[model samples]
Target chain A: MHLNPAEKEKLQIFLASELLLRRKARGLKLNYPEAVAIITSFIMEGARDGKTVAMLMEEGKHVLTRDDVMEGVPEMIDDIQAEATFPDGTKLVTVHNPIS
Target chain B: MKINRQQYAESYGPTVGDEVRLADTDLWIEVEKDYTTYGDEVNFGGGKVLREGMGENGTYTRTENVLDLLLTNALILDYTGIYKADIGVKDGYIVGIGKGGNPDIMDGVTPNMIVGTATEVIAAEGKIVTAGGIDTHVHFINPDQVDVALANGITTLFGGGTGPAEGSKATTVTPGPWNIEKMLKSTEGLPINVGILGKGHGSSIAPIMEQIDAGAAGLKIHEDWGATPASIDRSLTVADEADVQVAIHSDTLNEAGFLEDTLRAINGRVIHSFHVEGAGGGHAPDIMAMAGHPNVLPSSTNPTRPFTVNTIDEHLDMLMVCHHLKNNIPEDVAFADSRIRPETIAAEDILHDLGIISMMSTDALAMGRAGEMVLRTWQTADKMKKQRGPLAEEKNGSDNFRLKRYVSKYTINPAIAQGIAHEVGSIEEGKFADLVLWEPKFFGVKADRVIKGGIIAYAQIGDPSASIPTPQPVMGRRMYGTVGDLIHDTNITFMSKSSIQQGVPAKLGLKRRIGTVKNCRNIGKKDMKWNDVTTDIDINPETYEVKVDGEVLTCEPVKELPMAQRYFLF
Candidate 1:
């Protein structure tokens, strides 16, 4: 969930630039909040997979597909759900499915 | 069948009249449309009624209607004209501009409407709102500069002067990879939008490409950095292919053949050149000649002197007539003397008339001084009214005409040049709500309020209640290495007999040379300084020998020197 200052800065730049490129190619504007959400999910995925942020950014550029990024949203939600529990003996559960 | 309290609260509590499914049954009940509400209690379909303790005359307290954010009773200035309008923003985009005295046009849409509620309403009576100022040329390494920019009504900026290392400087402190990282990090949570240009010197195609891939908006080619015709060609080729703008700083007259050479090298590539007369070297004739090119976009700093003059005798003699006429010097007297040469006013006007010169920039001057610079531009336009010739007529104009024309230099012109015209240059529908609300007086220097993407970043509502919202970090891309890192990673061959070699050996060879020597101890990494020499030394070129403290020593190239040192030696 945490990265060194250098890695975090590098990851932010990489994610922002990739989002800009993707949106620009599609003739759409990428808003700041959407970019932050996507980056947060990617960072969570990187931490879960135990991969360096640099390696993750490289994979984002070459290997990761659009659907893979969408998939990260649910993966991140699951991670958050596992970490959250209420004092009343109740636990949070997340349900995520792609819309057809 | 009954549903649990959690399910009932989660679903039915939020909606007024909606279908509810009974637990353990396929039965669905549609609640009646007529619903009476009292403090979160409701009567559904005249069936089971949920009500709080109510007296005969009951009063219901409901929450305030929510919309995104509202700007009411502001003087809005777009390309079309200025008018009093109320702006409605939803989800960070301007949803509607209600004008013609109908203030709450969206009042018809109640809380039950499809769109969400408006959270805040700003009273902007007597404020003048225009597109957030876009500055095409700026130089900054620190993120705190964004505060100064926002205060001055500049919400979007294209950064220049942070690029490759120039000359023989081993380490460049300019905005190369490392510094850009620092800049990007510092801008996190800052209130403005930014893009950077890569420097063109002390760099080649690969590093330039690396910078572009890292998200530099463009490249800057400065004249003093020893840029060759071929280098210009290469830089232009790369920039064009990548679809980024290029800014060239070159002098047409002082550099002698530089304008001609640069023109030939550009060869129809789109470029923005700084300072029309090459700073001070620009004469009316040469500048006009350069303006003939269709592909070049010439920007002027205007009021600042392009070059310095040694004796004021010639200048004084020319301006004597204007002085004699006092502060009310006529247009004829102003231009009759060469002191107020065509390069200053005439050239600008001619270029403006020719439709070649458009955008204007501050060249990275301090943010606080931008107001005065803008004022000086208008004053210069006013002064040009004194000229008498055909060119003077073309250049001189009324104050109203000049004010509107000159304001565009900072706003729409720069936006068009940077290719962001559709987004933030002018106020229109379907555009990001980046706007500045300036006070009626002191239009250029002081901003009454600054709105970035529909969020109020700076506001000075009357009565000493001014507030600047804390900046939110807006992330962008930046390069990752320094100039030294670039050199270390690349394979660059050096010539043994060259001007650079002559300077290095003759200048610093006495103290440092790079090679192995008989008596020298190999101290490894600790002993390796940038200019330290390990080879047998030579000061005299003829004998290739040197006498240090009365001992004559013959110098020869040592093969054991490190590759970096060897490259430095040559």
Candidate 2:
């Protein structure tokens, strides 16, 4: 219920690529919810440690690179966004696709 | 001849009303004998025959071996073998399972422990009774979503691991028990037991331990998500020291070797690894090698139901989108994991045919598979009960054994894995009376009624006749507390039970496998047994309309549909 339809679509394609990526080597899969949990946790920790949503957004980019992901994963990652808890309250955090 | 009552009762042992045979004659009389009226204990040869049963008023009462609720003639199926018997429940736990397979206590020796003088009784002559499902790996976090799961026969679920919101409502992420208490308060009214699993990235042992103290059922760790190799290693070591179950999302097995390192790091600690076979850590169909680790409990995501036609269309667009993105890239790179689906099926077979994957769960989301979408036991039952061809009869052996072998993964297997098996996962005396009844023919395919902790969680009351008779879902009669109190002071659960419906015997009507107007939730079109209907199906790509047998299958508009229809189409 948190993500919009479009955002989830992007995530699905991203998951498909990551899951498919595993087929080639056997350890390359992460589903949408799995990836979302990581992103949300990062936001919470960053906010608690006195970092702004802006800083969290920027840091999320460098975590994975273009060559690191399959063809569609980067674009799907670009579309992912949600409101996560901060020290003040919940706020929206968006990441730029590192692959791009 | 006027016979003395005491002299003629030579061959009879008196309780109350029984046929008393005269000592030397074949004469029998219904003894309406009263101990209170006579002011003396009735005795036959010095044996006191005073069974004090409460009369309607002002007399002896039958108070021995009373049951709060009785389910009669149900085919009781649990970890133990199936039995056709009456199941007795009292004070939230099962009290007795009547004579192994007998419907009635006929011989003068065995007393019927379950029937008569009961607060409530349900006749389940043609139904199969099994333990209420315990879903440990569920990701249905929100209260409404949990309601959906309850309607689908899940009595206990463990989540708080992943959700639509941040911290997945974990105490660690929110920094106190406020969120945890609030979460519990929101759902405490329902009969379902909810347990939260805190998310950990191995930042430190103290913080992770802090989460445990904050009332987490377990701890969930990720391999790829924001967790460093050092972080994962450190957490696994901490998990080894702790007593809680850790749900691990393993790293890619053959490629990154994080899984190899994970096995070494934990050093035989109990951990639940998720999605081992299906699209998780890219380890599909490779469980045999790692399954030997005595401590590892692996479970897979199960989407037992198929997607709707609405999904088929959206996925068609997304399929093109995947294609568009891959067009510029080399075919080899784009299709790296193209073997994913086939491998996924192989892993499913490994779990079903070979029984390696110990559990199955729906890691459901609105945009993905809904948690209610999994008719999990249906899959296993079909393989044995329905799919028993001559080829299978020779190969697979007994259908009951095959059914239980697969269904145990949902019930006892996950319950043991989560360390809650002692309380639930099997229908036995002294266990929570969490029971589900289904038609034997459609056992596991759909539930007729679900009971959680001695309270009805979900029940189907359908139109009984061609005339005018239907039952509205009574408030306080189910896991969905009282909607009536909402208008007065507003309450989601508890502090309310309708007097109108209270103490009324539960109406065990004719069977309807998939029912409508469930407690606080609608039975969607997707809940239908699509296989029972014609296999001839057509989907209009432009309008996203599905037709079966040349007739349109009605559907929810795209915006209102589950995330599964939009995302799981792939």
Candidate 3:
């Protein structure tokens, strides 16, 4: 029942990349590195709380079940393959999986 | 000869010169004429045999009599000179015998007394002709025998009891031979059209005629548990007034004369003449027949004469009796399932052959599950008996023909008995759509679905439908305001740091006097590092302050920083 550190880290990195991509897509004025740091801090805080009620209610409790895990993996990998492009035509590859 | 034991005893009166025999048990007693000697036991072979001086001799004939003490342990035998039979007592009547054989066990008894068997063999046979199924009373609440009666094909049924509360009950109270014109409106599309009987002491002839006019098959008369003579007379007057069929259930008459007087007054049919029959003697059957009323027998609801109505002949009439089988499954099944006492089935067989009327129904709630529960009792008993022997040559019976006959006689016949003969009783053409489809199996038929008036009200199906997509925009709006709000509030923020570049630790002592830079172009810094310059200072007494690597870069006096750098920039 206990999730390993690697699994925990994967979730954190996943959230960080998603948040950073969203902020950039919104045309918010932020430095490239600063945005990454801010997104990473946001995910780090989220990871510290783990899959608590408020956290799961926001994200969804699908990760707890086997079918949801298999279904989510390929979807997450596909999202990773998509480029995080800036409005200035700069494309960045944010490879979030620590193992990868 | 040695007899076994007495089942029940009245201590006040011990032995009254009357010989006792436990029906169906191999025991008999012979009370002396003088009532002084203890009755001798005549045990056939089982148990202990009594010889001389085995029992204590008696002194008195009644109360604390010596003979009473000795005969206390003897079983009461019902004798028919040719047969020393043990009588089965039920509902206060002798129903069946223990065994068949003659023995002079009561030689010392009175000569004129024929003893317990009231009717001779010929009289018993004669009574069998006219006796039909008598439904004491029923409200068709349960669905157990509804189909069974249809399938069995009962002839007549006294379908009464549960009726619509206000209008139906109120209409029965008014006089003038029941406004049949008004009553017909109540039974426009009923599944079974049974003969109607007005309920309670308030009922009269006016409503009976009204019911008949309204298409009621017959009359139903029920006196509360203790009906007075006047109440019974009211029912009889109604039946006589309408000149239609009537069945009276009067359990209240403590004195038999009340029933006698009521029967005499009606000069018509009287159903269930239980108490009166014992007291009125020969006049009971005569009046019952004169009125064309079949002797409605007692059921479990009646405390006395348990075994009497359940006799083979009596049961035959009951099964064949044209009456709705209400909540009588337990008693009926008890007769069918009993090993030591299998009386109901025999009665049913006789009734079936005679083509008597009967119907099946439950007397409880109208829920589907309740209907099924009522049917299950009969099904269980039927299945149990079927398992006792190897499967019949055919699953249903000897042949499909016989099976169909059994079903028709048992079910369809009862529907006819209930007076809905041309309506929803059968699955024939033009009948109301009251039918159930069942799957036949070795275990018996399984009820799949019940159809009422061609509507698929209840059904059991296997394959379930696919999962439907759930709406998610609702969840989104409930969580956050909108997509715009979410992206704006959830975005990351960055702060400007070019002004503090000269404060980098690595750049300290390198430059002589680098001016404090508030603009991005003034400071010098490496790619990722910021260092402090000691002489690189700027002093603005009111608006500007210096900071190197987050620590205040104070020279001699400390000062408040600009509002933008102190609050907004961080």
Candidate 4:
């Protein structure tokens, strides 16, 4: 499955939402590996729950925004690149400017 | 007596009374007479030091000696903040600094004073003096390329893991015997102090510990340089015990879990991460780890990404470097290198606001651009776009702290990291007079004069109206304006980073203080042939006490710490 830059932009919601917020809140600094793991997990779980690739990515953006993560973190993100499994198959995904 | 500068150097610049030979096989000649010329140069009977020790040997006696160099009116910057002071260097050590509430360093002096003020005195009216930078994470250092460090305000630097003799073959994984003696001897005469970090990998920590005892300043641990979890554990454990810093080129760009595992293994043991910025280096993942972990100190390179050279070839080369460094590259026949992604590495900018960066060092990419690192970082954060508060500032309008830490970042941070803070790092007394005279603007991007151990190392040519040196006739003596103005002194000692102070003593009337001096000869200068000298001091006047070699000394055998604080003894 391949998604356009615009489709991936919706994934920003899950990236900074409470789901991933607790990773840093637990201890670690939410590195790329950690960030990718949580974001991809959210995507695959959404797909299994009968959501379309477009719906899950779009739903993620609606879940979180500038209010969640610490300051400048959302702004510091130039590109959030990842690969995750959807209902169809594994797809390369990236979210540009999640909350700038 | 009078002689040219060349003639004086021919004798190797030792004392006048000492027997000297002109060259490798030249016969020895004892000097009969030597005197100071109008320039305060040691002149041997005007014509005696002609060559082959042609001049008659000189036997001269002295009650006092002048500084090898004096820098006046320099706005000195140290951990204590900025202040204006006159720095005096003798025997390659900062022996005196004159400022505030201090007695006149130059009291009674005549053109014919036996010991002239100083051999050379430079006026730093519009300049700022900073302790030369102690760069501890450079990949290599060579004598021919030494001026590169000097010209950019670095007076001392350490090869990340290679010795100075051979130009380093960077990124070599194989462990070699770290020859600290060879490293020092090879770059013996270089203007800057060249130090080395032993390569730390492999199973045994013996060589790592051996290198530390052998004078290796730190250890460099690159990703997978024959490194295993156990090897890294052993390496950092030894570093923690030995009090030496271990620098890492993180494996965050490598196998997915490589960095977190290493961080877990080290577990807050202090380590320095190099080039913790761009993708070709450790990149953002590693930088975030540094911010999260306070013990993980970092030093950045000069380039603002697109990686240093800013060319396609170099970019590809760097990607390949990352590919080679990463551990998870599978050996499938259809495998092709992934397209290199350009990271928006404003880590230097963001990290500045966070205050996690320890210093700046030149990796392979930004080889000789130390000044650019300072100027670019400042211009980006200050002149261009103001860095607003992140989690650091929260809701503050703008950062009031840009360019402030830049000086300490380059100078003292790496010094303390390498455990060489006592000798270099900071313009403190008893430290090597390794100093850089900057143009007093733009965060010291331009160095007008680089003085290493009291010798003129690098001076910018045609820098008109620049701070230039003139000879002084009297090595200044400290004295109160009047005998009635007594000197109140409190002695202080610093031991193991703690200060102990003896209460201030009754103000003694100024009598033998600086009026008439006795038994003050030049015991040591740059080429010190003797041991156990007492040229230790620096004044923190606002604090009003002096620390001698990390100990507060009220042991006023010569003078109390407070008197020493105000008056630099001749």
Candidate 5:
């Protein structure tokens, strides 16, 4: 379920725009340093840059590789948990999360 | 916010030394008296000191029965804003300092009269002099003398060598268990303040610990072959327990690793100065963490060459880590190693990007080529391009830009790592007004002034003067200008002396008020022996009241405070 080149590029732009919007809504400036810092934070949380980039490209396609998906599964769950508890609508969890 | 210098000085200049009520702000408080005086300079009187025995290891001693051990004067004042209190002798007492009305002027006979006057006039007997500038650390003592130290803006100094033998060698040794009171007695009226430390290399933490308990300002760890992790830990523990400052000497490249161990022992407020080299020595992430601890101050004394030599190999690694930390690393890891030099730049950029606070210090001194090194440490994209040609532009353009941005961030918002940001290392008010004023040119620039406590302590008016002390031997020639010389020439005496003070009180119409001098002989023995003896002279107590220029003024007793308690007023 891999995305096509055009679709992948489109998803890249969408993820960047979504992240920027989320950051702004949370009163955080989405500057280059902030972008890098966030990416670094995600990587430190066990999400490799290559896999995250590929995952974002797959967006709603279930195109995530099992090994890569499993690698960031805990972080993804934590991200969803954070979004659930966000006081305002600033955080939105786009990834899939099955109910307990 | 930049205003015309002349206009600003004119409006604020007149307020100098005038006691003004300061407002409740982060900068200035009103509780501290603000004195405004006409002179562009202000001097705080040095207070009375009582002589005690210098332990077994002192160098000089006073012999004549009346050796002028301590000189007592008036209460000294520190200028807060644009005001200074008038401090001149009036009548028999040092008056008008904060006593209302104009301060009466005394015969301007400086140091020389101190001892003679004390013997002649009972009221004028105490030594009153300005507090000397102090240098916290230096290797030389006794042999170096007060003259050399005073000339170098160092009035009070904590000597480096440590040993019970060192204490036993002193002439007028301060009574000791190596505590604060003992240190004071050793220095009593010797013109300058001095402090002694117990040996640190031989696993003896007792002296250093005792000094701290007695309120010694800081600990000086002399790095030698005998120094070890255990000894270092013991000393640092004492420093921690006593809550005193610590300065560890890294005598050699191999000894540098001990800095990390010392940091582990003392948490922070450590000055790891001198000798940094070796492979793992140049740039360790741990060292950076220690440096960024907000409590550590590491000056790579003479490590410029080594850091520069290894810059090529480490720069790329430094850049990569910095880049990662600045933009994409996790907050914890990103900022964890974020304390590193290059990583700090990244941290600054990332923090600035995230609206967090960051700071930077030149860490110049000790590292030779201070100006160039400090500028290089703080340079950004524009300045980097100008200095490093195109290597910086191509190799690490983003990192350079980030560093440039961080440099600006620290100029105003530097990280307060050691908690000293409240008093110094800042530009805000109530803070010690220490600032580095600069003007940047396209290729070259100059520092206009280095302000300390709101006063222009060091100014570069024109071409920077090449000021360097002439290097002297370790055990240099015995320095002239003894304690007796300072007392007499500084007007510590009621009458005058031939060699030190020029005129006698009788010749200057002060004969009636100052009365007659009785027995005045050097105390102690010529060979610098130990003994408990008081040399007191008789004076006409009624003559304590004197008329200076027709205005009658009474002499007052000198108010003395312990060394550790001096800075509390600020």
Candidate 6:
């Protein structure tokens, strides 16, 4: 759904308040850049299904949940996988993985 | 023996059979032997004779000998005056200086008595041999610039700058460990002696000690890093402890009165200030105050700009502005509102007059451009002679003396400032044979040949066509690494988004709109439409207040960001 400028403005306020509330609940404070990065990810995710921010911010309708915002926020990954074979008929395989 | 007493008195400063002092020795010898004069020849005992037209006009003509290295028929500048003398070198030092066609007069002179010695001979008949140029301040000297530096007669160079990874950030701790290591490695095998300065990574002892341990010759403190007085004191104490020099780039524009306090805090510690004219609004007065401190040495740059000029375009611009000014142009129209100001040049002259500025540096500019800048510095001093009177005579006296003094600014003065004068500053005995033979003309002329560590690194000697010497390319190596182990990256997306918003609104008084959506997950893999993602968040330009969904929130710029958020902004 396409929203007018006034409707979009209202949606931005609604989303920003919700994000602030979520951060306050977790006792977290993010810089302007970090906040914008987090906020844009949700906005981009909402637009994937061809829905505007105004439509997502309508009464009783939320575009994202706390779990969705918190998911992969502090994500880190480390992986190592290898397989080696020797001419003397010896073979070795190794696998290392870390996820947070 | 019919001895002509008058000729003997006129020539040797004594009558026949009288005692005369030796040239390079204190031994007094009596002219006891008689000489039979035949036309223009006089033969003394043991075949000692003087031929006609020999040693005319104080010019020495000596026969070729089996010495290691002989510099014959060259005009050498010494304490007394300029005269044609034959210099004998052995073991990379000046062993003897012969006068009046007498090579044997240097026979019994000790190496310590005269200077030192060499192995080969150079026929510098019409050349002027002086000390090699010592450039004390250069930044980021790579291998490509080594030839240019050598061609301009610089035998020694001191170079350093901000860490490689950190672009323009202020840090209270060390920034680079890998970068500084790379810089130190770059100086290996350079034809000229290279010394690097440690940049002010932080005001702490650990960083200072780390830089010193990495073979830094000194430390350079920049003003833009918000160096407090306490930090300056800590840096100074650490430099003193390490027995290295400290150079400060004081803030003249932002912190007007800070330089004086900083200078006072130095408290007789050895310190060098780059571009002293940029000390404060009262440039000349501040520099004069700097001079009052015994350990303070100031270097002046005559660039069109205040600090270092990096690019060729900037160098050319400086050349145009300095050389192409009209006579009747108004000050406002003539002067570009950059670092290059008429008042600053005038203040430099005043500093020169007071003898406050002891050395001259190019501040990492191109070699040829720096040469031109040095020329302009002398030209400025020359012009001020009429108005300043005898005060100018101190630096610019006779033509030869003036040229010698000018060379000293780039040579002996810098060497003394860097605390290496005893090793390589001048063409003296017992010092390294770092010498340059210039074409006898004016200041700023490229050298005919340059010698470093007693080896001919570059030479363009003889008939100009047949003896064009090729300069060997020297590769540069990395010196040190960035100071700390971890790299801090501050990513500011909102600042970027705001800038993007600024470009969209072309018309004046029209506020651009931006919006954000929350709680959307797995956004990276999702295909999004530009219209669906875009928002209309109204922002007040002056206060930077954002109206987001009926709630007003203050959107401060990066500079005004809260303490925890602004930590890594710089």
Best by TM-score: 2
TM-score-wise, the better of 2 and 4 is 2
Q: Write the per-residue lDDT of candidate 6 for residues B107-214, one digit (tens) a residue.
A: 332232222121244555445566677666665433555555666666666656433323222211222444545544433334456656666536567866566554
Candidate order (TM-score): 2, 4, 6, 1, 5, 3
DockQ of each: 0.01, 0.01, 0.01, 0.01, 0.01, 0.02
RMSD of 3: 45.9
Estimate the TM-score of every prediction: 0.48, 0.55, 0.30, 0.51, 0.30, 0.50
Question: How accurate is chain B of model 2, given as a TM-score from 0 to 1?
Answer: 0.63
DockQ, prediction 3: 0.01
Model 4 misplaced regions, further than 4 Å: A1-100, B1-68, B100-116, B141-143, B161-167, B172-175, B178-181, B278-280, B283-287, B305-344, B364-400, B440-443, B462-570
True contacts kept of each: 0.00, 0.00, 0.00, 0.00, 0.00, 0.05
lDDT of 5 by residue, B1-570 (tens): 454634533332222222211111011111123233222122212332211111011222222112121112221211211122322222212312321111122222232222221121111111111222223333332443444433322223333332233432221112223443433333434433344333443356665455443433345454332345665666666655544334454322334454456555554433332222111122233232332333333322212221232443354354355334454556534333322233232222222221222222222111122223223323322222233333322222223223323333222222121112233222222332223332211011123333222222333321111122111000112122232333222212111122012232333322111111112111111111111111111111233222223433222111221111111111
Comparison by lDDT, 2 against 3, better one: 2
Chain B TM per candidate, please? Answer: 0.55, 0.63, 0.33, 0.59, 0.34, 0.58
lDDT for each of the candidates? 0.41, 0.45, 0.27, 0.44, 0.28, 0.42
- Assess the local accuracy of residue A58 in candidate 4 as a C-alpha lDDT between 0 and 100: 64
lDDT for model 3 comes to: 0.27
Off by over 4 Å in 1: A1-100, B1-67, B100-119, B141-144, B161-175, B202-204, B251-256, B280-289, B302-342, B349-356, B366-404, B461-570
A55-77: candidate 2 lDDT, tens digit per residue: 88788666545554433444544
| B1-570: candidate 2 lDDT, tens digit per residue | 343545433222222343322111112223232212122212211232212231101121235555566665455555564444557777667877752111231221113342334435655654667787766655544546655565555667665533346444211122233453344444444346655565556556776655554455566665434334555555555544444466765554334454455567556656666655434333322422344344566566554222222433453344345334354566533333431333233324333433445566665442223334236444433332322232242232324444445556567666666656656778878777778876432244336677765656566432221122111111112433223321111111111012112311122111111101011111111111111111323334344343435655432221222222111213
Q: Name the candidate that leads on DockQ.
A: 6
